[PDB]
Design a protein around this ligand. Structure first.
Ligand SMILES: [Cl-]
Lengths: 196, 193, 193
């Protein structure tokens, strides 16, 4: 009738107050939820320093940040791929090898172990071109022929291959003169013998 | 006029209920929308491992992640800039160059084509200091003088610059001895006369 | 009763005000979280796609610098990024080797290393000076070798010089002269009565 309509009205209003009440709560936590998630992500995400994006300064503090699980970047001129310690490791091993081989070279040269002129120890004979052919050693240079000195007298026999020195030459030149002098007195005695 | 009053209220309530529903729908999609965006972002954002930020482990799984379009890092002492494939490439070209050079230095020492002592082929003469001057070759060791051996007989003529060996001097000495013999007897015969 | 209408109208009015207030605070809250999300979307580093197998930095053609990268473990198989300081260390060593290779070449040319040296373009050439032993052998796989380019050596009782074909020739030349003379002594001594 008339008081009927009014209770119906107060009834709906009551439900409305309750539904508003209820909905405030749901909306609140929904808002709070997404905010907490956004804040968590922001706290963890890696970022460009600014809108230009030409730099990322990592947030690990003065120690720095390790970045790991980096797939081997292409190693080529003009390549803009990050490289990892394993790729750097490979390079270092070849540089270490080079460093050693360089050292070995220097050592072998001084130890008389490589090259045409070698010596197997500090008391061994020095050999020259021992594993190679040819029949001539030539010691001439841009100023002409060279004297070969420090030569120890060589063996003097029928098949000796020792070089002979200035001293041994002298001994030969001494008997020659001796011969000639003795030919001189042989010739003067022949001359006096004739007079008589 | 009380009937009109009543259905002005009913109309008002009807509109409140339309509005509450309108609000439910709009907040519903507004919240979904912001949630989708965040989720999408959380799936694609690259992240630090924990709050220390001393480590990022890339999320590509066991075969890892390529990082690309990295600008050449400053290569200076204690630089903390990432370096790229191109920067490694430049260094690598130097190592190969050095490795090849090291291989070639050794090779030429063996073939005897560098240094003061050389041979331009397996039957070629052995040259000693051919491209420099001076007038002496000293073969004396810390133990004094040395015997030169393996010396093939040299040419004996008016202009020969060949080294002379022991066989050659043996032969001369024998002629000299033969002569000195003869002269002794020739001078001994002269004593009798 | 006309009084109840007043109370209803008053509640309605408060409910509408509450709706309005809820709209304001929701509009503000949604905008705020969207701003944070957009800010973050714009500035976060991202994987190219859902595989996460590549990150392409958003710097443009010029590229993006990554700095404050902690030194990566340099070890076989390591998947840590490496920095400029680490690359610089390797570069210093590579440089050292490039120099060392250069010196070696230079020093071989200048005759300053090894068993055969010459301290200057006009100095004596020395063979195995700081070393001992008493033999130099010049035989190769083709046997004994001739030593040529040998200038006349000193001829005296304590000389250590090598002798050449010319010198031997002057000796051989006196022999033939002697032999002829001993002939003209014997053809003459035989004439004795
Ligand atoms: Cl190197």
């Amino acid at each position: 009738q008339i008081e009927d309509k009014i209770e119906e009205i107060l009834s709906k209003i009551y439900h409305i107050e309750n539904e508003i009440a209820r909905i405030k709560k749901l909306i609140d936590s929904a808002i709070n939820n997404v905010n907490n998630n956004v804040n968590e992500l922001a706290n963890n995400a890696v970022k460009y320093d600014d809108a230009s994006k030409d730099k990322i300064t990592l947030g690990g503090g003065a120690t720095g940040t390790t970045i790991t699980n980096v797939k081997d970047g292409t190693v080529a001129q003009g390549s803009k791929d990050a490289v990892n310690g394993g790729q750097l490791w490979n390079v270092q091993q070849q540089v270490d090898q080079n460093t050693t081989d360089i050292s070995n070279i220097k050592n072998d040269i001084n130890n008389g172990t490589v090259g045409l002129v070698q010596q197997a120890g500090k008391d061994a004979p020095v050999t020259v071109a021992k594993d190679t052919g040819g029949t001539t050693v030539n010691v001439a240079g841009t100023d002409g022929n060279r004297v070969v000195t420090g030569v120890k007298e060589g063996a003097v026999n029928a098949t000796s291959k020792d070089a002979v020195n200035g001293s041994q030459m002298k001994q030969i030149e001494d008997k020659i003169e001796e011969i000639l002098s003795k030919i001189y007195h042989i010739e003067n005695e022949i001359a006096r013998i004739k007079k008589l």
